[PDB]
Design a protein around this ligand. Structure first.
Ligand code: NAD
Ligand code: NAD
Ligand code: NAD
Ligand code: NAD
Ligand code: BPY
Ligand code: BPY
Lengths: 275, 268, 275, 268
């Protein structure tokens, strides 16, 4: 186990990547606290992992719930080694032109409150525990944090913003707490949009992501959620990622190195070297 | 005069970088519309520039006030060629540890509303006019949009966030409207912060910070904007990011600059 | 004139972008020295510009010729305000698999000698004059200096390398000489490949660049060479670019902000806002 | 043991970062082939690791020596899963002003030949085996591949150049072979330079330089490579760049780190 005796706090861990993360982290010897708004799914993750997992119902936008999550984690486990702010909301790539005027201000607050403020409240709440442990923060970014076309202006703005927290928090929490970001590509999760845009109940699993991403990713397929948890274990392992603070790992099937006419340069290499 | 017949709309153009831009765009033969919250400072630029300026007293956070900036720019001048969303707010470099739990929620909103939403509203408000003139957007960023230590978590994330609007608005507004970002640093503007809040001077730390070894006057930050607003010079450029901070990101570990003793070394 | 009384030295200025640059710079009040290997084209540029242009035959790979170019510039004009290293060679995007083993080492030296060493020798030679003038260096990069698919490993490596000289030379020549890079996209020039690859006599003007780039650039067309000179005037104007050292201006029709399924997001905006 | 059944080929794996990698990959259950110019140091790792290593004494600049590294890795172990081109040469941070006109031409070649061509030859030599195992390449970069002041013009351009091989080889070797770069800094390796040449210590400047506030042992730089060579953990990642330098690019203007007084501030 890369991670025996380590203690993680993960927000948005009752679905999608945050759940796979929880599963992975427990399989690696860690004990995990989850702050999520989803009551039933938090209990589902608790009964799956038998004491190695604590689940706290609450909102990432409330510092208080976040503080509660920290407190419960400390009460359940003794410490926090790794903070993984992760809970998130999409805009479904609604362009600026298509953001209705009566809806922009509300959509703005909703997406930024979860995506950016939710991250800031995770760090504020866990700060005393992370300095105590010399632990580390790993933020879930996205390809939308580096290149356009992965979300509308709201969402691309929020992910670019977390890159800004990666850097500012690596600076500010040094030398006691390390700060890094993982930037996953498309995932088959239960990612939702905001009420403003009537996307509360739209789920990204309902979008033909696997179909689309086959054409676009150099690596010629969308990874399974299992395969997006590895990078987080890396940053959560003391002995492996000690020299990394400030790090931005693009973890997206190579969206930033794709070609202009094809995603991949070497589909026919095996036969070009004729094996 | 590089911009004769061109019309700009500049938000936060009544003080600091924004005033220097008004003056410069007006001196280049451009006519300028200005949305600023400072009515008295809007007065002064209106007297300064005759009919070559119009101010609208509004808040960059209000989409409607933004609409009136645009519409009044259209009524005065007939078009908008270049939009410079520029209004912004700083956090005094307040470290997360030092943001009070009871202030953090409002202060997040105040800073992100002006700095980010404000930029979004300015574009949204100017979209039909820009697409019509096939114009250009130049957002003002900051060194804090790329490197730590130019603001706390709130400011830095706001300025990283606008790096994102550059790229996504470049993509989205193409092929009609070009979108770029200028990232100034090294200024000593009277950049203030929100009510929510009540950091050693740039002079005190310049040798560890600015390879250029000097503090440029505001007027020296105007040229990049003129360039990105000149269609005959900046046409290839959309999505671009111009670090304009005196070399902050190319500074040395022990000193900002490494060739202080060049003239004496090269016998100059 | 943005540039009255200014003095430029441009390498590779007898063809393609370097020529347009020369033309532009003279139209802007500047006097221009050109180091190029092309004898006849250097004389052609001299007779076009009547005293405002000096041309020196020589190779960018020889420090000596480069020194000669500096000397001639000083003799002709009195000073050097702006150094524009620019001469270059392409690999035509020959993939690693297609670089023959008997040819890699020679192709390596040729492309790196021109693309990177040629730049280093321009700066070494003009250094005394640029400190004297407090002038500035502007390197011609490329999109191949930022993203793949604009050249093979050799060429993408050389352009990434000049990004490295942008940064190291902005640092090292501060506070007396500013250092910046412009990174143009595809251009209809007379860009050649190396002898090793039998590309000496292949010209990029013979590649359907305009056709290809129509699909790929957000801006929906390849710019004319006239329209790639503006950025250089910006960096060559004292009063406009004084706070820029270290700067990297992507100047390529928006290759880094293109979409996954289309280059541009807003082909049908006029009708979306219905004008 | 994270890499049981996996085979790596590591160039410059007989000292510094490369030796730490050999040891670490061997301790993870991997079998390792090593191309290094240092025959005596190749001896020591051969005795250190029993049959779990093989060295070939060669030069990373020679395509043929590279071919024998690969082929001998195949004869010994049957496959290559992970190639770590890692051999490199520094310039002592020799400033351009200080590169002698008579040395500059050779020194350009020596440094670029090992550092860049060497990386190219290693991949080229290992291409049929990597594509066959659907493996991965991890080039060693450097802080000098991103920020100034970790080498003169020659070194820095060499390490920026490898950032380019990452992206172009990611593109070109896809979808079969993933290519990433690790960029270490903050080490105190015995990094030497070319004959052509005959810079204050990291200890002397650490507080302006490393937010982590400490000098990590070599062994602490191995984990990222293990990660990028573990197919079940690093599969999404191709073209990636992992800054692994203690936070050099996220350091402050006046001090590297900004929360030195956190424990006392948070009452820890
Ligand atoms: N899914 C993708 O394509 C993708 C790609 C890149 C990055 N990301 C990022 O991955 C992260 C995880 O999202 P996901 O993709 O697993 O979607 P998901 O909806 O399946 O998981 C996100 C979790 O966030 C929780 N959550 C949302 N708002 C909350 C709130 N206000 N308070 C408490 N909990 C809240 C939800 O209950 C859910 O369990 C987000 O940061 C997302 O932007 C997603
Ligand atoms: N200080 C630096 O070195 C530095 C560096 C990079 C970028 N900047 C940026 O430069 C841009 C211009 O600011 P400045 O530095 O010139 O500071 P400034 O305060 O002198 O100028 C800001 C202007 O914006 C106006 N403004 C502020 N909030 C507003 C609102 N809500 N609605 C309407 N108008 C509003 C102010 O009244 C003022 O006229 C900002 O985006 C700032 O973030 C400053
Ligand atoms: N053309 C493109 O698509 C493109 C795109 C981005 C960047 N660039 C860069 O633009 C620059 C200019 O090249 P171009 O596109 O105008 O091609 P070009 O061949 O038309 O111009 C380049 C000039 O370099 C000169 N030159 C080449 N080798 C030389 C040597 N060893 N010594 C002296 N002079 C030499 C040639 O004579 C020629 O006049 C290069 O740095 C190139 O990589 C080109
Ligand atoms: N010093 C730092 O902080 C730092 C930072 C980032 C990256 N690096 C890089 O780490 C990598 C490993 O180097 P190191 O720092 O461990 O230094 P090192 O000298 O201790 O290791 C280099 C190894 O490469 C071998 N080598 C050198 N030239 C060779 C050649 N031409 N052919 C074959 N083998 C050759 C040497 O014999 C030695 O075993 C290099 O790419 C170096 O550039 C060092
Ligand atoms: O972070 C993200 C979250 C959700 C979707 C995407 C996405 C990207 C490209 C195409 C379609 C969706 C994304 O990047
Ligand atoms: O710098 C460059 C020089 C020559 C060609 C390209 C290019 C890029 C994309 C597609 C085709 C050619 C390039 O980027």
């Amino acid at each position: 186990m890369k991670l025996t005796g380590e203690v993680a706090l993960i927000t948005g861990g009752a679905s999608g990547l945050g759940r796979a993360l929880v599963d992975r982290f427990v399989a690696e010897g860690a004990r995990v606290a989850v702050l999520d708004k989803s009551a039933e799914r938090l209990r589902e993750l608790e009964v799956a992992h038998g004491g190695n997992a604590v689940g706290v119902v609450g909102d990432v936008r409330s510092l208080q719930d976040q503080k509660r999550a920290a407190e419960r984690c400390l009460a359940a486990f003794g410490k926090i080694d790794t903070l993984i702010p992760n809970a998130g909301i999409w805009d479904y790539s609604t362009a600026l032109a298509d953001l209705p005027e009566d809806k922009i201000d509300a959509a703005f607050d909703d997406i930024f409150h979860v995506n950016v403020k939710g991250y800031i409240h995770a760090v504020k709440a866990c700060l005393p525990a992370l300095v105590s442990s010399r632990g580390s923060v790993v933020f879930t970014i996205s390809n939308a944090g580096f290149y356009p076309n992965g979300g509308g202006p709201l969402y691309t703005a929020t992910k670019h913003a977390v890159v800004g927290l990666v850097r500012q928090m690596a600076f500010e929490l040094a030398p006691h707490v390390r700060v890094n970001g993982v930037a996953p590509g498309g995932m088959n999760t239960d990612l939702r949009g905001p009420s403003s845009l009537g996307l509360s109940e739209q789920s990204i699993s309902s979008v033909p992501l696997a179909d689309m991403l086959k054409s676009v990713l150099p690596i010629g397929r969308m990874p399974a959620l299992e395969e997006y948890t590895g990078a987080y274990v890396f940053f959560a392992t003391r002995g492996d990622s000690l020299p990394a603070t400030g790090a931005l790992l693009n973890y997206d099937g190579g969206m930033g190195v794709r070609g202009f006419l094809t995603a991949a340069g070497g589909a026919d290499l095996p036969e070009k070297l004729n094996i």
